[PDB]
């Protein structure tokens, strides 16, 4: 019998290369434009992943678009945290196999704070020693953790999917531990981590918003990512979006 966790493993996309162009002025602007080009391709990969995610296609198309537009930065930063954990134990930002950034190069203008914020996400994977299956279940829950205050068009379907993957997270925890003493404690810690992602990514999103709107910074964005931000940004800045939290705020 096939399991949901085994399917999450098989649909996880391969890591993308940047195609980086080390033969140029390592300016802050060019690095940010390079990262956004990689980010746009990673979002395309994440859309294809969501289409294959068991249950996601049952949502109204408009809800599928809302969830991807609202959560894309959480997905990208969480996966960056995982790669940086597995490839460098949280010491370097492992954007792609050909684009590994150590924190000396984060001294570039506008780069220090955002790199510290990305490293903090990776440091949580190190602290908790997150397993691959726990990571895969948590990543689905991030896709399902930011919603309009006024609700979704297929609310009942959404409620069912979200509860399904909360249960799957519990199953991944039970598998990680040939015993029982820590199952609830572990679920508590990982749902605390999920809740904390909203704030841990908030500064990254605000910085992205500013580089998108402030054209004099000359940061370039690829086409589909620009479309996504242009829809997400007004909703976030207007306060019309809410996080789904497991614990009292």
């Amino acid at each position: 019998f096939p399991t949901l966790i085994s399917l999450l493993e098989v649909i996880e996309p391969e890591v993308l290369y940047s195609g980086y162009d080390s033969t140029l002025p390592d300016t802050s602007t060019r690095l940010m434009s390079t990262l956004n080009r990689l980010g746009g391709r990673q979002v395309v990969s994440a859309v294809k992943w969501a289409k294959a995610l068991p249950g996601f296609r049952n949502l109204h198309l408009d809800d599928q678009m809302t969830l991807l537009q609202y959560s894309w930065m959480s997905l990208m930063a969480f996966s960056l945290g995982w790669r940086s954990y597995k490839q460098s134990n949280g010491n370097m930002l492992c954007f792609a196999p050909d684009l590994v950034i150590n924190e000396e190069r984060m001294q570039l203008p506008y780069m220090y704070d955002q790199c510290q914020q990305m490293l903090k996400i990776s440091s949580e994977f190190v602290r908790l020693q997150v397993s691959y299956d726990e990571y895969l279940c948590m990543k689905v829950l991030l896709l399902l953790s930011t919603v309009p205050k006024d609700g979704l068009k297929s609310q009942a379907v959404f409620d069912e999917i979200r509860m399904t993957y909360i249960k799957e997270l519990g199953k991944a925890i039970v598998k990680r531990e040939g015993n029982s003493s820590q199952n609830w404690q572990r679920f508590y810690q990982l749902t605390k981590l999920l809740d904390s992602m909203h704030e841990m990514v908030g500064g990254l999103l605000q910085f992205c918003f500013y580089t998108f709107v402030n054209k004099s910074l000359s940061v370039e964005f690829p086409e589909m990512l620009a479309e996504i931000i242009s829809n997400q940004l007004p909703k976030f800045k207007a306060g019309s979006v809410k996080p789904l939290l497991f614990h009292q705020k």
């Binding site: 859309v47 198309l61 678009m65 991807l68 589909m224 479309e227």
Partner: peptide, 12 residues
């Protein structure tokens, strides 16, 4: 006809 909508409706 946004790019995201097109991708969600596309086959692959």
């Amino acid at each position: 006809p946004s790019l995201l909508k097109k991708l969600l409706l596309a086959p692959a």
